[PDB]
């Protein structure tokens, strides 16, 4: 059995302009003390990091801003931030509501 | 290729997880949870689909409206994922297996467990 | 590491009772360029598929319309329109918004 936590987070910012993001995170852990990570952490980590997305030109700090790259681009920090014995799994991150990429490790 | 049935249904329950050695604050949520189950498609389908919710909600019913501290010792969604998880696997019919359960406490915080 | 792009769209039909369907489909890709695959050119592959089903009696087109076989349906309409470099990852399809089958390739 595998045991995940996961969060829900969302920011604007705009590329090429200007969409809504609803951004999902899987952790992969053991369960330990009854939990596999604390949910504000993880929420506190995600936020950090989108908080450099939020209402922004992506195409400065991105070459390419496309759903797939911003997507890499925040699983790279997410996993940079997270506590040991956790891994980062899945990242779901949607532009629109119907329009999205899943990258699973 | 696998093929699964899946059922979402929802409960409400209070709950205060441990914030130290001592507990926390009291506070209610609707609980949503999705439970895929695994199977054949034999005759056109897996799995009856009330079937399958009349399992399932025969066990959240054990949860909905309670105060889940005085149910768990540690009422983490994690906890009562596994629980729901063991009772649901317990009943299920000898063709279908328990593939994954998903539960949110809310809309934007949950757990998965997957087999 | 895997990676896709998702497209949800919805449909209502009938089998005989009538409901809306909601579709999600994910397609299994390298990135290559920034993105797998454009959403655009998906969602019309997707839609040119669904639209055979909407406001029809799915018992006029199917000798057993459940929602497994629905889906499995569209699964190898989808699978023989896409693109060289990619693949049929996972359809799911919602009769309403409380049940639905899944189908991972």
Redesign the interface.
């Given at each position: 059995?595998?045991?995940?936590?996961?969060?829900?987070?969302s920011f604007d910012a705009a590329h090429a302009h200007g969409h809504t993001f609803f951004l999902e995170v899987?952790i992969e852990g053991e369960?330990k003390?009854?939990?596999?990570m604390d949910?504000l952490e993880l929420?506190k980590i995600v936020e950090e990091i989108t908080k450099e997305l939020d209402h922004r030109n992506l195409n400065n700090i991105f070459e390419?801003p496309?759903?797939?790259?911003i997507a890499?681009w925040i699983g790279e920090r997410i996993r940079d931030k997270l506590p040991p014995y956790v891994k980062l799994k899945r990242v779901?991150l949607?532009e629109g509501?119907?329009?999205?990429?899943?990258?699973?490790?």
């Open positions: 059995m595998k045991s995940r936590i996961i969060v829900r987070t899987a369960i003390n009854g939990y596999v949910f929420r390419n496309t759903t797939e790259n890499l779901v949607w509501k119907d329009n999205g990429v899943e990258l699973e490790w």
